[PDB]
């Protein structure tokens, strides 16, 4: 399932470059190894996908991502983002790691507000639906 998720995100990347910056051709012209460390349970597995595309884009243009921008989501092969499950444990894990920004599918704006206010202090969220939003909340 992660393999199809990977190819989906991959093709979306290949589309995003030509839609965005035609002069680059790094993606369509080069082999690429990509490694996702284990630990995610298969059912939440797709939630990693939104990270994947930004990985490649960082490798693609070569600019570093803005620091400590944790995220999760699920990519649609046409730029929609989709809800993921089990967010509360994810957010506390981001708290332990010193995260100071975060991005979630807008469809999960509900669960994040269930959280106790002390949990939410010091984070800085960006709900999103279409993927292009994230492109401007990382790089520039």
């Amino acid at each position: 399932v992660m393999k199809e998720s990977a190819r989906i995100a991959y093709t979306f990347a290949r589309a995003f470059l030509m839609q965005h910056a035609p002069a680059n051709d790094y993606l369509v012209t080069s082999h690429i190894h990509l490694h996702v460390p284990e630990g995610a349970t298969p059912k939440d597995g797709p939630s990693a996908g939104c990270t994947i595309v930004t990985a490649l884009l960082s490798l693609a243009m070569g600019r570093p991502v803005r620091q400590n921008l944790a995220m999760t989501g699920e990519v649609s092969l046409t730029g929609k983002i989709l809800p993921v499950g089990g967010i509360k444990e994810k957010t506390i894990a981001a708290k332990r790691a010193g995260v100071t920004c975060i991005v979630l599918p807008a469809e999960n704006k509900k669960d994040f507000y269930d959280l106790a206010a002390f949990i939410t202090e010091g984070l800085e969220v960006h709900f999103v639906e279409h993927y292009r939003e994230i492109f401007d909340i990382a790089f520039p």
């Binding site: 399932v1 199809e4 589309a15 030509m18 092969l77 046409t78 929609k80 509900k110």
Partner: protein, 353 residues
Amino acid sequence: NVTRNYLDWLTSIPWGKYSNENLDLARAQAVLEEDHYGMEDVKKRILEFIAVSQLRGSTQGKILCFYGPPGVGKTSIARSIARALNREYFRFSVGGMTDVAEIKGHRRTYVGAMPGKIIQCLKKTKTENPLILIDEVDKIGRGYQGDPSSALLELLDPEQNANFLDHYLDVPVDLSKVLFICTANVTDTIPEPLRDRMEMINVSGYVAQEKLAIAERYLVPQARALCGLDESKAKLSSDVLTLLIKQYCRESGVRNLQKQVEKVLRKSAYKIVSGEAESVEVTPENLQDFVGKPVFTVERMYDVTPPGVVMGLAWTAMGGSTLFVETSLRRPQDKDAKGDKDGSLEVTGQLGE
């Protein structure tokens, strides 16, 4: 002591005890329309069954099967029939079972042997013709270790049932009068030899509006009796329900709405016994308190459908859902103004070949 337990197990069994049926159609009407709304097709079939048994003399067995999305009320209709015909009821799940001995007991020379489940049903139900309800035929444990589902044919085959016998008390029983019924979410997984025997009735889904008329009568009062409240203190207008079903639960079955209304009532119970209101009255403004914020909202994700995406209905394993199909370029297209390579497709999304 072993043979004594065996004598007991044998004597309990009816051999000709025949719980009598009512057979007038009128009373069967009244007892069916007051228990389950709609799903009239199964009612009509059972009605024809009643009509034939009354003609050809004696009581009659028959096999039938029900199938459809989970939580449509299948198991619920079973008991309603059980008190309709006046047959005694007995559920018997078999999803994932593999112990053919469980369907047939044990040799009685084994330590701890006891007769298969059916004999327990004969001892308990005391009729020769109860309403056995095999459950989840689709999910029977079908292994290398001897498929019980093959063993089931000895029960359910109209001819081979007539002298069924079980390892505990060897003497054949005569199950012909039993009225078996079978329930499966999808009919195709069912093993082929068995599938041909039983009749295949089809319970359906439910329209969004249809759930409204459902829940106001057969559902809210049920949970109201489960939480121990009386109507005096826990009214729920219809409007709250239509809002619920339209938003908080997108499932063709009613189980999920059943979870919500359960939750609302039990929270109401907490507001009564110690809380503030002496009579909670959920109103649309109040509800989001009790059950929290809405979960689903944006039914049908895309709305403009950007080029190259189209909706497609799909008769999934449970209910039906409006999954989209999507496509996209994977390389710059004009790789060569003269280029002649077939624009090979690459399908994805857990294709079966």
